[PDB]
Amino acid sequence: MDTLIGLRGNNFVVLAADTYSINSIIKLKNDDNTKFYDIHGNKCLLLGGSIGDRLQFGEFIRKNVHLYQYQNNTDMFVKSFAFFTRKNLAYYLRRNPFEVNCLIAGYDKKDGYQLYWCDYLSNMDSVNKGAHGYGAYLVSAILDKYYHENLTVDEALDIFKLCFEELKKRFLLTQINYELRIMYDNKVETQYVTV
Amino acid sequence: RNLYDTDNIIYSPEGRLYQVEYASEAIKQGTCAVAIKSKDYVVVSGLKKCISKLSFPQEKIFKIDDYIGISMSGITSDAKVLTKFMQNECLSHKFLYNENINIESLVRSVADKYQKNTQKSSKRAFGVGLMIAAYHNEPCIFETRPNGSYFEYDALSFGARSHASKTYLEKNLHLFEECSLEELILHCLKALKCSLSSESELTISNTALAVVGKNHPWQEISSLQLEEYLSKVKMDAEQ
Amino acid sequence: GFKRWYPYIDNGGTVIGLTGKDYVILAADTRLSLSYSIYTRFCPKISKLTDKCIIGSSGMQSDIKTLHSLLQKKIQLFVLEHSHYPDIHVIDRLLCVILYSRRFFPYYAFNILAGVDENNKGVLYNYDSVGSYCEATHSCVGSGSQLILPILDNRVEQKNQLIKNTNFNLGDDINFVKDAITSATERDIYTGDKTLIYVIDKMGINVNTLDLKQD
Amino acid sequence: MARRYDSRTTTFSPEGRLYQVEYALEAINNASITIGLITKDGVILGADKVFISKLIDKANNYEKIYKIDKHIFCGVAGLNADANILINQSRLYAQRYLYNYNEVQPVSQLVVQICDIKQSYTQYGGLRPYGVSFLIGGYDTKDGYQLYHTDPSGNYSGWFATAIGTNNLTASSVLKQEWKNDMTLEEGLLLALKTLAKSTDTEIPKSEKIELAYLTNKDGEVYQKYLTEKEIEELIKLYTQKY
Amino acid sequence: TTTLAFKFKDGIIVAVDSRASMGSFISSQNVEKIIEINKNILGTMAGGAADCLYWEKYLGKIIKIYELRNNEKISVRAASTILSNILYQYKGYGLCCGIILSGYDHTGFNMFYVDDSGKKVEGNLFSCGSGSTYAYSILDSAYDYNLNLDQAVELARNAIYHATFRDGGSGGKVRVFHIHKNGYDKIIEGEDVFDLHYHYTNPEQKDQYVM
Amino acid sequence: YSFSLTTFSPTGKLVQIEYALNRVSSSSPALGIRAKNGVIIATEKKSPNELIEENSIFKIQQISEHIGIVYAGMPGDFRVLLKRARKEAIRYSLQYGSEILVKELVKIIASIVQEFTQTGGVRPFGLSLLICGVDVYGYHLYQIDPSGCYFNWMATCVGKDYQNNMSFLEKRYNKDIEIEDAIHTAILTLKESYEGVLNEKNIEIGVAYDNKPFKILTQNEIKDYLIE
Amino acid sequence: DRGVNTFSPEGRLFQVEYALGAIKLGSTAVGICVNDGVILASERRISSTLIEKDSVEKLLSIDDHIGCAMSGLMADARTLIDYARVECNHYKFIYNENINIKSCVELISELALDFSNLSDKKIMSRPFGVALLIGGVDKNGPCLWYTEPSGTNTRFSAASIGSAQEGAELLLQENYKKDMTFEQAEILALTVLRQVMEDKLSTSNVEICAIKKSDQTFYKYNTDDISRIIDVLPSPV
Amino acid sequence: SYDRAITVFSPDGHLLQVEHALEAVKKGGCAVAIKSSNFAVLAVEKKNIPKLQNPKTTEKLIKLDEHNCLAFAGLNADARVLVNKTRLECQRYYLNMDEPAPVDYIAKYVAKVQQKFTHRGGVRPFGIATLIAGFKNNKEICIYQTEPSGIYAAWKAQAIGKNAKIVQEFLEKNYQENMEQKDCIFLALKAIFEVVELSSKNVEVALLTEKDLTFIEEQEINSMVELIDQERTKNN
Numbered sequence A: 001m002d003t004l005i006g007l008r009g010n011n012f013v014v015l016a017a018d019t020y021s022i023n024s025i026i027k028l029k030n031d032d033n034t035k036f037y038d039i040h041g042n043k044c045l046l047l048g049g050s051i052g053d054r055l056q057f058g059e060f061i062r063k064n065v066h067l068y069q070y071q072n073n074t075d076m077f078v079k080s081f082a083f084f085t086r087k088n089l090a091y092y093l094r095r096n097p098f099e100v101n102c103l104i105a106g107y108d109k110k111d112g113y114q115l116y117w118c119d120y121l122s123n124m125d126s127v128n129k130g131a132h133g134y135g136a137y138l139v140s141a142i143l144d145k146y147y148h149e150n151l152t153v154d155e156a157l158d159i160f161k162l163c164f165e166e167l168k169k170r171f172l173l174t175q176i177n178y179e180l181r182i183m184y185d186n187k188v189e190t191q192y193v194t195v
Numbered sequence B: 001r002n003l004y005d006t007d008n009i010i011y012s013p014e015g016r017l018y019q020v021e022y023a024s025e026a027i028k029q030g031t032c033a034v035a036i037k038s039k040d041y042v043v044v045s046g047l048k049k050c051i052s053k054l055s056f057p058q059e060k061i062f063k064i065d066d067y068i069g070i071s072m073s074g075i076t077s078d079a080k081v082l083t084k085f086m087q088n089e090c091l092s093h094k095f096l097y098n099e100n101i102n103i104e105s106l107v108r109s110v111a112d113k114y115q116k117n118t119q120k121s122s123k124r125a126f127g128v129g130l131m132i133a134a135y136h137n138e139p140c141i142f143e144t145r146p147n148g149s150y151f152e153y154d155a156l157s158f159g160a161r162s163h164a165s166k167t168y169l170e171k172n173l174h175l176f177e178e179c180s181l182e183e184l185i186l187h188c189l190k191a192l193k194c195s196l197s198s199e200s201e202l203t204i205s206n207t208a209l210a211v212v213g214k215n216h217p218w219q220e221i222s223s224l225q226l227e228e229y230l231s232k233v234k235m236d237a238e239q
Numbered sequence C: 001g002f003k004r005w006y007p008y009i010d011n012g013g014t015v016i017g018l019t020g021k022d023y024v025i026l027a028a029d030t031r032l033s034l035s036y037s038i039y040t041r042f043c044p045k046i047s048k049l050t051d052k053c054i055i056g057s058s059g060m061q062s063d064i065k066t067l068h069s070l071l072q073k074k075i076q077l078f079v080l081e082h083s084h085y086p087d088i089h090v091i092d093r094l095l096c097v098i099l100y101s102r103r104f105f106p107y108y109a110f111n112i113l114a115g116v117d118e119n120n121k122g123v124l125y126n127y128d129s130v131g132s133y134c135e136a137t138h139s140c141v142g143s144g145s146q147l148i149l150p151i152l153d154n155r156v157e158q159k160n161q162l163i164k165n166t167n168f169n170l171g172d173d174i175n176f177v178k179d180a181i182t183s184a185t186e187r188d189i190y191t192g193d194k195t196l197i198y199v200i201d202k203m204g205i206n207v208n209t210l211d212l213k214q215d
Numbered sequence D: 001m002a003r004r005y006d007s008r009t010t011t012f013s014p015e016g017r018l019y020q021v022e023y024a025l026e027a028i029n030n031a032s033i034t035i036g037l038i039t040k041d042g043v044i045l046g047a048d049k050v051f052i053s054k055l056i057d058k059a060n061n062y063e064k065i066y067k068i069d070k071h072i073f074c075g076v077a078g079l080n081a082d083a084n085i086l087i088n089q090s091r092l093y094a095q096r097y098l099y100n101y102n103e104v105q106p107v108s109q110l111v112v113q114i115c116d117i118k119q120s121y122t123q124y125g126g127l128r129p130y131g132v133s134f135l136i137g138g139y140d141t142k143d144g145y146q147l148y149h150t151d152p153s154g155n156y157s158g159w160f161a162t163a164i165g166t167n168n169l170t171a172s173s174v175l176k177q178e179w180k181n182d183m184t185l186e187e188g189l190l191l192a193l194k195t196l197a198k199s200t201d202t203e204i205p206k207s208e209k210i211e212l213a214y215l216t217n218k219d220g221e222v223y224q225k226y227l228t229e230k231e232i233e234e235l236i237k238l239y240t241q242k243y
Numbered sequence E: 001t002t003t004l005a006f007k008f009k010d011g012i013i014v015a016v017d018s019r020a021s022m023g024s025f026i027s028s029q030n031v032e033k034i035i036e037i038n039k040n041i042l043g044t045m046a047g048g049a050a051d052c053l054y055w056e057k058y059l060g061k062i063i064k065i066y067e068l069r070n071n072e073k074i075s076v077r078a079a080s081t082i083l084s085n086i087l088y089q090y091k092g093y094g095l096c097c098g099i100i101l102s103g104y105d106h107t108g109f110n111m112f113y114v115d116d117s118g119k120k121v122e123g124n125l126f127s128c129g130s131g132s133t134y135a136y137s138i139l140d141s142a143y144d145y146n147l148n149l150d151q152a153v154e155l156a157r158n159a160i161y162h163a164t165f166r167d168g169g170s171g172g173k174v175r176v177f178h179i180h181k182n183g184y185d186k187i188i189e190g191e192d193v194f195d196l197h198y199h200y201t202n203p204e205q206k207d208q209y210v211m
Numbered sequence F: 001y002s003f004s005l006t007t008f009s010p011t012g013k014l015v016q017i018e019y020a021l022n023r024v025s026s027s028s029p030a031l032g033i034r035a036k037n038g039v040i041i042a043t044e045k046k047s048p049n050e051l052i053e054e055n056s057i058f059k060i061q062q063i064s065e066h067i068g069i070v071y072a073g074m075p076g077d078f079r080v081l082l083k084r085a086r087k088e089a090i091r092y093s094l095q096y097g098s099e100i101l102v103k104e105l106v107k108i109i110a111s112i113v114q115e116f117t118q119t120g121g122v123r124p125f126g127l128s129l130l131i132c133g134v135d136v137y138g139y140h141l142y143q144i145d146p147s148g149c150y151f152n153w154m155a156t157c158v159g160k161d162y163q164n165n166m167s168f169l170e171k172r173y174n175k176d177i178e179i180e181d182a183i184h185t186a187i188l189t190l191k192e193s194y195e196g197v198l199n200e201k202n203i204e205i206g207v208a209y210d211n212k213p214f215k216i217l218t219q220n221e222i223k224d225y226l227i228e
Numbered sequence G: 001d002r003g004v005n006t007f008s009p010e011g012r013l014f015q016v017e018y019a020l021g022a023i024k025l026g027s028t029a030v031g032i033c034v035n036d037g038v039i040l041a042s043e044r045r046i047s048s049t050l051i052e053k054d055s056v057e058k059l060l061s062i063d064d065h066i067g068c069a070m071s072g073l074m075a076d077a078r079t080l081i082d083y084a085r086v087e088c089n090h091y092k093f094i095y096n097e098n099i100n101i102k103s104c105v106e107l108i109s110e111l112a113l114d115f116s117n118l119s120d121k122k123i124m125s126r127p128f129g130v131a132l133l134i135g136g137v138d139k140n141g142p143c144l145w146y147t148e149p150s151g152t153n154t155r156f157s158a159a160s161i162g163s164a165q166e167g168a169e170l171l172l173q174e175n176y177k178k179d180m181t182f183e184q185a186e187i188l189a190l191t192v193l194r195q196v197m198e199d200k201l202s203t204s205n206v207e208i209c210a211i212k213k214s215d216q217t218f219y220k221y222n223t224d225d226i227s228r229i230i231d232v233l234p235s236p237v
Numbered sequence H: 001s002y003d004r005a006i007t008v009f010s011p012d013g014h015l016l017q018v019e020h021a022l023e024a025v026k027k028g029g030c031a032v033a034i035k036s037s038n039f040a041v042l043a044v045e046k047k048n049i050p051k052l053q054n055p056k057t058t059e060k061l062i063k064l065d066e067h068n069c070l071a072f073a074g075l076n077a078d079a080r081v082l083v084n085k086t087r088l089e090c091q092r093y094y095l096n097m098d099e100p101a102p103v104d105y106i107a108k109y110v111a112k113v114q115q116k117f118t119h120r121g122g123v124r125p126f127g128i129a130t131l132i133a134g135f136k137n138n139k140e141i142c143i144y145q146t147e148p149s150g151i152y153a154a155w156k157a158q159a160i161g162k163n164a165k166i167v168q169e170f171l172e173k174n175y176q177e178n179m180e181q182k183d184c185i186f187l188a189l190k191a192i193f194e195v196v197e198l199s200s201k202n203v204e205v206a207l208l209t210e211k212d213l214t215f216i217e218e219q220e221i222n223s224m225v226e227l228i229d230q231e232r233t234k235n236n
């Protein structure tokens, strides 16, 4: 299972994922890069599930959003992007479902920093903190406890370090390699963390 | 008439279909093909069209099945479409029933294909006339026309300046039934020559010749045998 | 309260193939059976595709018949269109396309395509009902394949023999095929009656017949 | 031969022009005048009402200005039936965008969609074009207040102040010489009345022949007001005092 | 089946076994699991032999037409994307394909693992088949990017041998090819693993080896 | 193949719609009047011969409760459009549980009429419709032209001499008239238009008033009204 | 006035006749087939100095063993060549062998006459107005075929297309021999092109391609080969 | 549906519909595109009614994807429809190949679409000519020109639209290989004003680099126009 974590503050959004590409009982790669889908205009789709469905849905959404932005010479709003993603997932749910969980993060002037939680059933809602996978059970309470308003990026990264330590110590799958996407100060940064 | 030849679904005040008539007119512009039959064999000869000095002569007779072949006069694309149709019909009958198709039914289906194109204004008649030589319990020659009609002949000839060939065939018709294979081939070559212009000559390059018979599957006559036959024709004409 | 109908049956059969320097052999048993009954004692399993190519299949008789007829129709259409007879490699690719066209409801037929190519070399292709593999020396499909293939491996490859034999000829290979089919008839209930042996070589295709046990 | 009856509407002419589109433009230019302008407080759309009879129900009856959405409205010049078809389509398009994206469609995007319908009609098939031209005004948070003009060919262009229909040259001259970048809603309404009077060749406008509407964005909401006869009469009294 | 590929300082090493089976019966010992898609791309196939062969031929046709139209060689990434999209369109039909596409293009040497479920993983070292775990262990215990060609070929041969030894579905002959900038060479056309066992594990041949 | 038979002319007109309007203006006259508490539609239905059954000809029809329709033009076109209007009304009822609104029905029928001026292989409808109705928003009288444009009328006339009839009706129409006054004025207008002497057999009347079901007056009631 | 399928009183299709009129223009190309291979040469009517030479090519490759010279409408020619490429690729896929040049030519003609709608489907609305010279090497050896809008395919030992087709054909007829070698074929092709060309023959106004029986691989001559043949050419007379 | 053959052969062998599409193109504005070492410069004529039209709305210089840009001359609605088709095809190529669509591929697609519209029944040709500037898979800048007939060709510097011949002659006279950005912009402005009235609001210029397409600032265009005006005054 792929553990996804998302934290939204007044000045940032941090997304985190494990970097494992899994095929049966072996890890194909310890530095997987098929979960994050960065979208022009400060948007990010973090996907979790089977690699095939992940790739198909992520690329479909990214190309559709890029087509929209090129056709309209404008940046799609984060709320529009999130609800477009949810509408597509719901449309395919009853025909040929993608078995993917989504964390949709972004920034725009109208609504600031935004984070949306969506499950494979296409149940979506905007949240301040969210998680997906079997590691959600072990990181959700840490997020709840140590989250507060007016949190800073470094305090959020400390919370994420606590989460990664918990996933290494107590989670059945000892996950040690994580990738983070940080949106703040109208710039997107990539980090790699090993515990 | 200028007012009634625009489309193929309009009858003239004389009840004529000028578009279909023009499709038939396309046939008279082709090279001459002749087909005759004895009690056992059908021989089909034809004049291959050479565009220029450096061009190869064009094909005139085609094989449809083991004991079925055709010659065409008119538009080559139409001839190709009909040839593919006939070949697929014969092959599909062999596939479904493990036996040779009935030539009469094949010709009827080809004639229906002709006709179905003359009933709509979005289509046009085939500008090609077909001569079908086959052996099915006996030799048979069929002619299919652009308007959807088909007839059965004892001897047949179409193409440009083919009336000389028709005259020769009408003169020698009584002899074909009891002829041998060599005599029949010579007669077909002589009719083709009758059509041919005096300046032109029948050579192995511009003459196509095929035979289909009792135990003789449709076969083109080899170049050497054709040369022998043409030499015989020239020699006996010299007398 | 009705039971579902299964669209597949096995009608038995064994087809062996064996190549040589300038020849190929395809032998097949002619029994047709349904469960523990014999439909008929003479149902040929080998069809001639070209003067240098034949195909033998084992499995469901209706599927085999339809597939052989379809291949023959395709080859005749190819001859008419492209004005030359396809060789065994073209026929192999054609059969592969035909077989994968029904990938999700496959023909219940395992087929050996035997022939001689333009170099005058024997060629065998083994088809597992969807796909093809070129066989270097020998092949076998049908109910007796598991009995026969070890024998042909022992007699041809001789991989487990320090003192080997290399003089292989048409008569010895024919005798090997007869022995293999007889041994299969000993222990396989679906192989028996008569067997047809086709030899393709420079002189063409020749068909001989051998008698097997009728029980 | 059914082709003898075909007029070949979607066919080029020797000059690289479409006769059907040119004739539709002639119909539009024969239609009555529709003006539009942008103030710092909103978009004002005005139209001249063509007189039919005094038995027409003149209350709650706007026939040249329509609402496409809460933030988009349009004025029509051309064939009313074609305009109604295109207006229903535009309303469907705006609601479809809201359904797809959970946000209101931008005015430029809506204009592009309806103009694409018109262009497709001019290019594909063998049907005649739409004899209607639009002045689509609206507001959105991306480009602010917007005013677009669309013609039968599918061409469209953005404007700060424009006029379509009969005698649009006089209205365009008036707007060119009077319009200002920063105007209040009242000033814009007075200018709209002046240009309508000039196009209609009159001094004192009559409220019985004037349609006025304005779309503003106040207190975080887009509000459209279609002035009634009494409100237009108050505006006309103000205009009379001014001039 | 055991197929493996890995990048090293002089290109890519591709290796496979030659065994085919239906159930517990060995159908053949001399099948070819490495195919060339074009001059600069090799695909190693595992799983359903018919599915792999048919879809590799399909990909080759698509790549040939693309190259003819655009007068340029296709990239390994683009070929992998085409194959993965095609395979994903058939998800839920029973296709069995695991393909490693390794090749040289304008962006250096590239290696992608593609599955019948629509996966496409870029990597430096892959292994597929029923012996993939054993091959993976052997490769990981002794892999290095600075191996010479001979050392890399030896490592691939050893990994295939151990996979065949431990896995009942792998065996026959071992083939090792080398992809370099100008094409590909077949270093080991096919080598019986019978000799490999008595070279590696039981050189003395004086008693039965005890695993 | 389908191409538009109605096309723009060099002056920007649709002569086919003009000619449909000519047919309507040559057809028999109909009128509608909105009263203070109701709306009436009247029409002149003459008898071409003594053998026809007047009760079989239906010019004033009921689309639904509280909605009636009359036409001037071609009866076959009218019958087609009347069937379509009834189908649309019951479609709205199936969707929304209540009766269709007059404005909504008029818009739908107007769009249907418009489609026949643009689609391929067809001619425009050769009639004008007058649709009267009552709903929660009041009393409505709408006219639909062959082009597909609709007009909201206080009182109107279509058909022959519609200009003279409109002038006559305007000279004696005010918005505060009652149903009885409206019926009297309708009969007066029809009598003025008709050459000769009118009678209850030559006219038909339908009324929708006081939130009551649409009613088609009988010969006896029309005779009572004509006595004056 | 007339439909695309109308027959003329002489039995001909008006649209086909008009497409035949269309194919009469364009850059002039010649093709020569000898025992050792087939060579197609063409003139390049470079529009101006700002055009990229590589972006314009009158000699294309339909397959690894088939080359084509085109004349008439260039967009229609590119459409036809793309269709031929697709069909040759599909044939190679389904038969694992190289298509015959005759079969390729037949497919091209079938597409060319598509607008007639004689068998039901049809997508083209009019003839193509394109003339082709298709050369290649198959199991029967080198061959050269000419296709025209009317759908008729001929086989030539030497042929020409373009604006100067008549003069090129006269020169080829009076200078071509059956038993010429490849060097003589190249010399003859470039001599005809030089004679019929408006501009002085150079290494930038002419392009050549060859399919030799040995390799059976389409090969585009570059400046080195073109200049070598130019030097070998005899002085104009 | 409607499938009449709108584009047919004339007795002389011409496609009159295509000729009329070319006439529509000649009735359009002027667009110039000049190539350089690793960048391109595209200038286009603007036609706005002062003080009433919104200059930003009309856009003849558009971006198809992250690396391809387009200019056109002819019918604006046809251009818009074709450009939307091309953008969709750019994203479809990206989805199908995992790489951005190169300029040569996109130009070929545009030309194929225009040919198809000349060769399909029930449709009329696009009345627009296009200049497409982009990068190839080897990161090489390239400019392509496509016409209503569907014929495309790569160029070093090309002008389309009204009075395209004069601008093309000026380009052939004044073009040099591997110019700097400012010199290339000056050349494009001079070429376009060879036929367009000299004014900074009569032209829109963009510079395409691997990074992005950047529109030149109004002050820079004003300075360059003043320099051109000074040169013209001196010459006269």
Ligand SMILES: */C(=C\S(C)(=O)=O)[C@H](Cc1c[nH]c2ccccc12)NC(=O)[C@H](CC(C)C)NC(=O)[C@H](Cc1c[nH]c2ccccc12)NC(=O)CN1CCOCC1
Binding pocket: C126, C127, C128, C129, C133, E001, E002, E019, E020, E021, E022, E023, E027, E028, E031, E032, E033, E045, E046, E047, E048, E049, E050, E052, E053, E096, E128, E129, E130, E131, E169
């Ligand atoms: C690897 C093994 S594995 C366990 O990792 O899947 C091999 C890979 C392989 C084998 N052959 C080739 C050829 C080309 C490329 C790759 C190849 N896979 C297999 O061997 C398959 C394993 C099963 C579990 C999927 N086996 C097969 O596909 C069978 C091949 C075959 C059958 N008869 C033959 C005769 C001669 C040569 C080969 C074969 N075929 C099947 O089992 C499929 N059908 C299913 C229906 O019943 C008939 C067999």
